[PDB]
A and B are shown apart, each in its own frame.
Chain A
Amino acid sequence: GSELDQLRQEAEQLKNQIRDARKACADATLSQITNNIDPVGRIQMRTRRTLRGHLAKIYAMHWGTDSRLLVSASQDGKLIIWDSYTTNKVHAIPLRSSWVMTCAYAPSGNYVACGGLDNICSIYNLKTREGNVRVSRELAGHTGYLSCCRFLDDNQIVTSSGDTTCALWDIETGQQTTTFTGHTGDVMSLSLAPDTRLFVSGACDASAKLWDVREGMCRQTFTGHESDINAICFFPNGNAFATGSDDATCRLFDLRADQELMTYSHDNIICGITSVSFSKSGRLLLAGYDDFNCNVWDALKADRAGVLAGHDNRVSCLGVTDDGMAVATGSWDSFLKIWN
């Protein structure tokens, strides 16, 4: 009708105004400003430890708070907690559903969250008087496969699923308290701000959105990619975040100014990106492609500064310790590697 056409025209002219306002504040690029900083030398990393025991495909892993323990999830229906320094196994949790796609470790080291392809997120309690590991709560209410889950606190959790919606739950009650909507395609990854107040998410419609936990409604939207977004991560400062897509390109955004700061890509790489992570100081960026190896960049000049080529299949998960002592990489060949 006429009202629909006039509202669409209004939306188009607001989009034009937003584009003009964004282009107004663009004065310089990061490369020009960082053109005088000395370059970091060639980085050499060696496989200090190799973790074995999984007999299927490994899909996710998460570091602990003390930078000693990590948890990993495999399609053999198993969730394994490791001991990085001594290369030992602490706990092995069976799963009712073997189609796992994500895992999360509580910051207090008390609970572990797991879910995927079953519309259910299960919480497991580690410290039990009985001596075993038991499931505490099964959150249900999603109509699509769960893509990501992160512990907001010891009692709150944030989940992102394949039904184009994000949810914030309450473990003791078992019911949703806030729902975030606005994505057209499925949502793949989310990252939490260091102050535990905001979080960004990425969707298959080549877009990222910022959300506030308290209000529960969106604030900003970032576009620029040409394919699906597979990974996302915050800067240690909290004023920027990096996104990786399937079109062989990584991008770094900013919060105060909604622009493109720098892009990372090469002519010799035509493959997608699965995981992206930062360093403790923010000078160093790591990204794991599916061409059987990882790659490393200087975050301020966009130049490769080392290759962690040690895997025989696609790299799926990558993590960095809180103290920045070592990095961990998992892949489809059922192997974890620690680099220092």
Chain B
Amino acid sequence: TLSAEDKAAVERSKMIDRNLREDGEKAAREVKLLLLGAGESGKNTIVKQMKIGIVETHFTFKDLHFKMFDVGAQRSERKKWIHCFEGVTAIIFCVALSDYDLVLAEDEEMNRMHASMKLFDSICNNKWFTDTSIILFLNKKDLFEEKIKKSPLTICYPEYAGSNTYEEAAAYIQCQFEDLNKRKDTKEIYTHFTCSTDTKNVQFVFDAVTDVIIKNNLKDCGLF
């Protein structure tokens, strides 16, 4: 029925379909991570530690290929473009715990710690991230331990009664971050403490990603 110049078009369409499928098979071998924060939290330091409009980063660790997205420079309305990151494997959230004393430039009354907690609450309880894993990095702890002796922690939290040491303060901050979750069943939060000099953040990320991959594989087969 078809003429001589339609069979060639059909063959061209078939070749296009084959190449498109072959190229799309390769995009499922990538582990996608979304990096967020509060501006001065220390994104750049963590990025240069784990590495040998929108910013994209590649790296590899033990035969695993990572795809890191940084969107800190958007400065736009987040609810209008946050739905593009639906199938992200994990979220990486960086916080500088040495900024409890300081306050934001925009408002002297509002401190950076409360802003970070509010943004964490907004991201965690979104309708698009019901079953998305969150990794929480707390960076620059050496300045925090050097500054905790001069100034008390009661400025940020007036309802705190502790020995004002490093361990208790770190545990209290960790618990305060962990308590904002509202699912506790299908969502998991991983917390870690780090300074400028370290070599074990990539291992933490690798373990969390391995757990997420195992959960996804179990859920796909129906055994979960």
Distance in Å from the Cβ of B14 to the closest Cβ of chain A?
Answer: 9
Whether a CB of chain A sits under 8 angstroms from the CB of B27 is yes
Across the interface, which residues of A come within 8 angstroms of B12, CB to CB? Answer: 88-89
Q: Are A53 and B53 in contact (CB under 8 A)?
A: no
Across the interface, which residues of B come within 8 angstroms of A126, CB to CB? Answer: none
A135 to B52, CA, bound (A): 32
Whether a CB of chain B sits under 8 angstroms from the CB of A26 is no
Interface membership of chain B positions 9-46, coded 1 if the CB is closer than 8 angstroms to chain A and 0 otherwise: 11011001101110010010000000000000000000
Interface residues of A in 226-246 (CB under 8 A from B): 228
With A53-B20, A117-B53, A117-B81 in contact, do A88 and B76 touch (Cβ < 8 Å)?
Answer: no
Distance in Å from the Cβ of A63 to the closest Cβ of chain B?
Answer: 20
Name the interface size band of chain B.
20 to 34
A48 to B77, CA, bound (A): 39
A97 to B53, CA, bound (A): 11
Q: Are A88 and B10 in contact (CB under 8 A)?
A: yes
A-B contact count (CB 8 A): 56
Whether a CB of chain B sits under 8 angstroms from the CB of A259 is no
**Chain B at the A interface: mostly helix, strand, loop or mixed?**
helix
Q: Are B75 and A144 in contact (CB under 8 A)?
A: yes
Name the interface size band of chain A.
20 to 34
Whether a CB of chain A sits under 8 angstroms from the CB of B223 is no
Across the interface, which residues of B come within 8 angstroms of A163, CB to CB? Answer: 76
Distance in Å from the Cβ of A145 to the closest Cβ of chain B?
Answer: 6
Q: Are B81 and A145 in contact (CB under 8 A)?
A: yes
A220 to B75, CA, bound (A): 29
Closest to A119 in B: B53
With A55-B24, A86-B6 in contact, do A204 and B84 touch (Cβ < 8 Å)?
Answer: no
A88 to B19, CA, bound (A): 15
A143 to B80, CA, bound (A): 16
**Chain A at the B interface: mostly helix, strand, loop or mixed?**
loop
Distance in Å from the Cβ of A89 to the closest Cβ of chain B?
Answer: 4
Across the interface, which residues of A come within 8 angstroms of B54, CB to CB? Answer: 97, 99, 117-118
Whether a CB of chain B sits under 8 angstroms from the CB of A64 is no
Q: Are B76 and A162 in contact (CB under 8 A)?
A: yes
Whether a CB of chain B sits under 8 angstroms from the CB of A78 is yes
Whether a CB of chain A sits under 8 angstroms from the CB of B74 is yes
Q: Are A204 and B24 in contact (CB under 8 A)?
A: no
Whether a CB of chain B sits under 8 angstroms from the CB of A76 is yes
Whether a CB of chain B sits under 8 angstroms from the CB of A75 is yes
A89 to B13, CA, bound (A): 5
Known contacts A86-B9, A204-B80, then 11 further A-B pairs from the complex at CB < 8 Å, ordered by chain A residue: A55-B20, A56-B24, A75-B84, A88-B10, A88-B12, A92-B16, A119-B53, A162-B76, A186-B77, A186-B80, A204-B77
Would you mind naming 17 contact pairs between A and B with Cβ atoms under 8 Å apart? Answer: A53-B17, A55-B20, A55-B21, A55-B24, A56-B24, A76-B24, A76-B27, A83-B9, A88-B9, A88-B10, A97-B54, A119-B53, A143-B75, A145-B53, A145-B74, A185-B77, A204-B77
Q: Which 6 A-B pairs have CB atoms at the shortest separation, nearest pair first?
A: A89-B13, A119-B53, A118-B53, A88-B13, A55-B24, A89-B16
The interface of chain B, by Cβ under 8 A from chain A, is: 6, 9-10, 12-13, 16-17, 19-21, 24, 27, 53-54, 74-77, 80-81, 84
